[PDB]
Structure 1
Amino acid sequence: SGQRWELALGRFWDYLRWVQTLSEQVQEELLSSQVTQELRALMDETMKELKAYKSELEEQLTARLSKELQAAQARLGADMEDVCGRLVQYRGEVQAMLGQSTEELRVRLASHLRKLRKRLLRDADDLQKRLAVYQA
């Protein structure tokens, strides 16, 4: 409901913010698949809560707003998917480097995540304001 999918998105954010640091613990868990499994779990919880919320809104109301909303919905999902895909890719690349320095890979991952965070910010804000106008 209103804040349900938002609270779930907040939990994805909390985790992402820790991952962004790419400390050695993050790295241990990135390479063991724990980070990606958990972020993926938080993303799924988010999109499903959003789906349920938008479906309930759609149900109680008496259509451009609608199609745009779907798209805004897709944008957030894609932002979260990209984050996940970025981390999964990093793991794959590192495991193929045979112990060689991962420095450049991490600098690049960091930059990708900083950019996606700016996207998550505006995309969620856009979804929030659209869901609010949609309301019957």
Structure 2
Amino acid sequence: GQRWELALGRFWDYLRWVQTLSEQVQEELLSSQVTQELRALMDETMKELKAYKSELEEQLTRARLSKELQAAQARLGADMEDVVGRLVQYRGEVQAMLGQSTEELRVRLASHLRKLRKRLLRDADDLQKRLAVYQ
């Protein structure tokens, strides 16, 4: 129930919706709305994570653990940036189609998103584990 976990949960719920590639998702993927909204949720998650670590350091080998926690935090942020970037890519590939069917592009986006989401989830679990043993 930590603040950064709730923020990550909002990013995660939003991305679970994007995965469906429903009509309204597809509409908002060709505007900047999905990637703008996900970036805001990403930034919030990272901000709350930074503040949580800072407060944990008040209730605490340490050097190694602190560097490993930094690396796990950076992985989470890179994962979220990779998701946003893949969705920016999709918008460009649609435009290149010049009005032609995007069904194949959507099948391919859906399968790639599943794998990016798998990576984000496993990195979030690893980060949560390191935060629990840091404290």
Fold similarity call, TM over 0.5:
yes
- Once the two structures are superposed, residues 21-78 of structure 1 have per-residue CA deviations (whole angstroms, 9 ceiling, x without a partner) of 1012101011111111101110110011101111222344392111111111011111
Deviation at 1:81, TM superposition (A): 0.6
Aligned residues: 134
> TM-score if structure 2 supplies the norm length?
0.93
Aligned counterpart, 2:24: 25
Shifted more, 77-86 versus 49-58: the winner is 49-58
Q: 2:114 matched to which residue of 1? A: 114
The normalised TM-score by structure 1 is 0.92
Question: After superposition, what is the alpha-carbon deviation per residue over 1:57-107, rounded to whole angstroms, capped at 9, x for unaligned?
Answer: 234439211111111101111111111001011011111211011122111
Q: Give the Cα separation in 2 of the matches to 1:77 and 1:58.
A: 21
Q: Distance in 2 between matches of 1:92 and 1:44?
A: 24
CA distance in 1 between counterparts of 2:25 and 2:51 reads 32
Q: CA RMSD in A?
A: 1.6
In the TM superposition, residue 121 of structure 1 has moved relative to its aligned partner by 1.6
Q: Percent of counterpart pairs with the same letter?
A: 99
Q: Distance in 2 between matches of 1:73 and 1:129?
A: 12
SS, match of residue 60 in structure 1: coil
Within 2, Cα distance between the matches of 1:108 and 1:54?
37
